[PDB]
Ligand SMILES: C[C@@]1(c2cccc(NC(=O)c3ccc(Cl)cn3)c2)COCC(N)=N1
């Protein structure tokens with residue numbers, strides 16, 4: 001799968017996007033890769049902050065589905081008109097598919113002011129598709145209409161704003177993108193890419209919480225979220241343990257909550273004074289787990305737009321459960337193995353790390369009562 005390697009691009013804090021083509025003749029658009037949603041939604045109107053947009057009138061193969069959608073979020077929101085059209089991926093498999101498309105006609109706090117993408121490729125399952133599960137997601141259509149195997153994998157690499165890159169391998173796994181072995185965790189339910197975190201460790205030390213807390217109300221793997229988001233009780237326990245672990249220098253209480261930055265002298269970044277973070281995921285076999293481990297390079301993010309100088313704490317509290325965002329996924333090569341209801345983790349060949357430590361995917365470990373860690 002050499003032709004799909006390095007097919008993702010982006011800027012720091014603005015997500016990873018892939019080039020796609022929509023309509024006949026083909027209109028080129030840059031589309032955010034999003035494992036935490038399920039709509040293929042593109043800007044269909046001349047928003048002043050978008051570079052490009054989908055012009056339905058120019059497409060001979062566009063079919064109107066005569067149905068609106070209104071999708072609000074915690075802050076942002078979009079509205080659009082449903083349809084279908086012929087979609088392709090230039091740096092993907094040599095195929096063309098009839099996919100559902102939400103033509104976004106109005107939005108607020110959805111598009112990023114001066115990013116280089118014009119839509120979202122929701123890669124999750126139909127259950128969370130707006131307006132309902134009858135709207136077939138893009139990847140479900142691709143698999144049905146072609147011989148592309150029912151899996152994809154993401155290598156998100158990370159860094160005025162720094163220019164990031166990566167790979168979305170569609171229909172397979174590229175072994176040059178990871179070191180060591182892939183370790184697999186079951187997809188608990190096919191809606192989001194839901195998983196079960198069974199144990200958390202900060203600097204080798206267990207938080208010793210009831211493992212329902214770790215997955216309350218769920219844990220997901222989400223390429224469309226920056227932070228490692230943790231449930232409130234888990235976040236407090238984690239921050240307290242990170243604080244005790246990093247007692248070289250002291251910071252204000254606003255830094256841990258993401259209410260302010262922290263800054264050092266230029267080119268004197270203290271990585272060594274912060275701990276590694278380990279999440280134990282449920283394994284393939286009864287009573288078996290494995291642990292993925294991230295470095296401070298993943299969760300202390302350099303912020304480039306100040307007016308490496310300054311940094312932000314990219315672990316935050318959530319009321320929507322755990323979200324294993326870019327902070328997690330920049331450490332690992334992630335295989336979304338839909339055909340076998342599982343998600344693979346391996347150490348990524350492009351993850352940022354120092355001379356002393358690296359990210360890791362280690363196992364197997366014996367953990368009891370792992371199914372009790374799920375929330376219902
Ligand atoms: C649909 C939705 C969504 C809407 C609009 C934008 C974005 N995502 C980004 O802007 C972004 C930024 C940085 C990085 Cl590393 C990744 N993604 C996500 C809702 O919110 C969470 C989610 N999973 N998907």
Ligand SMILES: [Cl-]
Pocket residue numbers: 056057
């Ligand atoms: Cl028209």
